[PDB]
Amino acid sequence: HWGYGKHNGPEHWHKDFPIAKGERQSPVDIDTHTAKYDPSLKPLSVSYDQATSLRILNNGHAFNVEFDDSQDKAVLKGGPLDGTYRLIQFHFHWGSLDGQGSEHTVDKKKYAAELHLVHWNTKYGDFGKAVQQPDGLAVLGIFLKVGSAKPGLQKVVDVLDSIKTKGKSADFTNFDPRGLLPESLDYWTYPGSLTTPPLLECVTWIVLKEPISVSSEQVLKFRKLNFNGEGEPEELMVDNWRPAQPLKNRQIKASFK
């Protein structure tokens, strides 16, 4: 199926998923001089104090930390958003080397990794219905640079040995995603898509300006995961990012002056 290799990676996805060449694909390069401060942006609200994490899964493309989204427990509101968006999962994209890994870029700069906190608009009832809507999803994107360790990441790092291969999962209750956030909530926003197949154009992207720092040891452990299943030849899970796509008829707005 689809993946990140030379024979099934981003250059091939359009054959099964023609929206790959659509009008609102993600990620994009964020040209900081072209982005415009938007005074209509209401304050952003990240309310994760009641989050209920459940499980961590290696899905063959990345690992997902999944949340109970059966009630408004961890929600995103404000900023460009109308209404309430419920956290369903987070995951990362990362590189083989520290100089690449992020999906979005900032003035063409690539970060070592990028965290995506995925939320769905509660007006549509379920995630599956939300992904049939142009305002179905909101993804909070956070860049990772290598420097000092991120303490709130370490519990994720330490469980990765138990989900090495595709299809493995582990309990991952009582994880607090507040520990993955930078100090500032300044952000850029634009309308886009999922960055993995099926590449659906349902996402309001909110990309924080401030990266979090993680240690070289932390990202090195991401790179020991495997794309393959148990019993198959080892394919390290690295370079699971889609490059920047054409901006087309979009404007990136900044929340900050």
Under the binding rule (CB under 6 A), the answer on residue 116 touching ligand 0VX is: yes
Q: Which amino acid is at 212?
A: I
Among 41, 76, 87, 139, binds ligand 0VX (CB under 6 A): 139
**Residue 60 corresponds to which tokens in the numbers above?**
């063959």
CB 117 within 8 A of CB 140: yes
- Nearest alpha carbon to residue 166 among 8, 65, 59: 59
Is 33 annotated in some ligand binding site?
A: no
Task: Decide if residue 77 touches Zn ion (CB under 5 A).
Answer: no
CA angle 113, 200, 114 (to 5 degrees): 5
| Residue closer to ligand 0VX (CB basis): 44 or 194 | 194
CB 178 within 8 A of CB 48: yes
For position 189 contacting ligand 0VX by CB under 6 A, the verdict is no
From 14, 33, 61, 119, the catalytic residue:
61
Q: Is 195 in the site for ligand 0VX (CB under 6 A)?
A: yes
Q: Which of 44, 181, 194, 244 binds ligand 0VX (CB under 6 A)?
A: 194
Q: Which does 113 bind (CB under 5 to 8 A by kind): ligand 0VX, Zn ion, none?
A: none
Q: Is residue 14 marked as binding?
A: no
In the DSSP assignment, the letter for residue 52 is -
**Is the separation of the CB atoms in 114 and 104 below 8 Å?**
yes
Q: What is the DSSP letter of 19?
A: G
Query: Which residues make up the interface to ligand 0VX (CB under 6 A)?
Result: 116, 118, 139, 194-196
Per the annotation, where are the binding residues for Zn(2+)? Answer: 91, 93, 116
